């Protein structure tokens, strides 16, 4: 639906969750896929193979729109970031450009309090 070819696929592998989502060039979201909804709850949420299945979940149920050249703009320096990319290339897509527009602050706000 809406007919889009260039699908901006924001893949955000944080630390223990990787979300893949193709949207419209404008901004109209198309379909999502997550390492937490496809299963793999655990240290598996922090694995690139789960990100490979995340790419597969973002490979089907999205052909209704039909994207070919997609702008895989990766966000958040996490576990995947390549296994997910080659999952999409082995899914039937042609990534026109892999961009690294990760959520980057100029050390704006303070970072969160976690891990020990």
């Amino acid at each position: 639906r809406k007919q889009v070819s260039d699908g901006v696929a924001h893949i955000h592998a944080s630390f223990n969750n990787t979300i893949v989502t193709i949207t419209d060039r404008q901004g109209n979201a198309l379909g999502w896929a997550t390492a937490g909804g496809s299963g793999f709850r655990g240290s598996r949420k922090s694995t690139p193979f789960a990100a490979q299945v995340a790419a597969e979940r973002c490979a089907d149920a999205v052909k209704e729109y039909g994207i070919k050249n997609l702008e895989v703009m990766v966000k958040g320096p996490g576990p995947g970031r390549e296994s997910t990319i080659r999952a999409l290339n082995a899914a039937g897509f042609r990534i026109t450009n892999i961009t690294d527009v990760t959520p980057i602050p100029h050390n704006g706000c303070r970072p969160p309090k976690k891990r020990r």
Partner: protein, 65 residues
């Protein structure tokens, strides 16, 4: 950051993402600030890296094996 390589590729090659920062900005904005801490491990690290240079200066004179 933004790699394209026209259309004959069948590969990602995010080698510039790593040549940019990748984990660079993350190392400071993933876990709390701690302000002074990183400074501490900077001194220890240098002591062992400069000693590596002293190591390169120690091997040049003999190493008769």
């Amino acid at each position: 950051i933004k790699v394209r390589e026209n259309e004959p590729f069948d590969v990602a090659l995010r080698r510039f993402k790593r040549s940019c920062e990748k984990a660079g900005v993350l190392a400071e904005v993933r876990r709390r600030e701690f302000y002074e801490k990183p400074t501490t491990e900077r001194k220890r690290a240098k002591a062992s890296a400069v000693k590596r240079h002293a190591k390169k200066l120690a091997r040049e004179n003999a190493r008769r094996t």
